[PDB]
Design a protein around this ligand. Sequence first.
Ligand SMILES: O=S1(=O)C[C@H](NCc2cccnc2)[C@@H](O)C1
Length: 291
Amino acid sequence: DPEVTLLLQCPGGGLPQEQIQAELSPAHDRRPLPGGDEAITAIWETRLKAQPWLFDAPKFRLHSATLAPIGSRGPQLLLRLGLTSYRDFLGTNWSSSAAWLRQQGATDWGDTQAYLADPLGVGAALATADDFLVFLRRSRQVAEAPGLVDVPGGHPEPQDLAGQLVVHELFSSVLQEICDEVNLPLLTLSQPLLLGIARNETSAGRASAEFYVQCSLTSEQVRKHYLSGGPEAHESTGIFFVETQNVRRLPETEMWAELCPSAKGAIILYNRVQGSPTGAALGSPALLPPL
Ligand SMILES: O=S1(=O)C[C@H](NCc2cccnc2)[C@@H](O)C1
């Protein structure tokens, strides 16, 4: 699967909020472009002169994420974060010359990402009470991955001693994205677990944190809540459900060629971290069928 690479696979079936540290530092920002950031300003002016209702927004930037030695006590993950924007995204990751900016970063800084905005996404593998994952169909009229399958999520906007507030906002944001798009009550959702981090190579390597969330509603009830918002309550054009049993072999199905890269990330991490039993009981052939 060339369009998605794993940056992080969490241990212990996934990491809760209280085991994660963040360092939000201007040392983690994008480096100014070799010829100057005027080139980002020029793409933005052109875009606003066609679509003057567009507005900029701040984003978190992923620099790096370091996992503690497995089985250790204390914080298990450090996320190194800076700040970027929708505008810096449009002028770098989304630019036609994005591959040239990756080569320049390798040459200048020993870092393919040094000249890229790399805004941090969040996504969820959202399971129902009746053991299904939730999928959404993307509109055919949006700029990115039109008409493809997605999972719930988005790209949080800002606002360990500011770090903990930043971790809280990331975990809060995946639940808020589920309530905004799927139309579920907050109180039907578990606290998220972080499964890992996946990179979208079709979007010059920008990363998404992938989370596991359990809902107390059945697939039937989740569908009712989604539809009862009406065509204006969501950006997606449809919702559908796959049995957790069947997610295990999803990369062998015709669905796989219709998943956008960040949703492929979420399903691979679900399969490795929540799937893939290690013990004798869930390992036994009748519960883990071979092939
Ligand atoms: O947070 S972002 O900068 C906003 C962006 N939205 C999709 C999009 C794509 C191309 C042009 N406009 C919007 C995220 O994919 C990254």
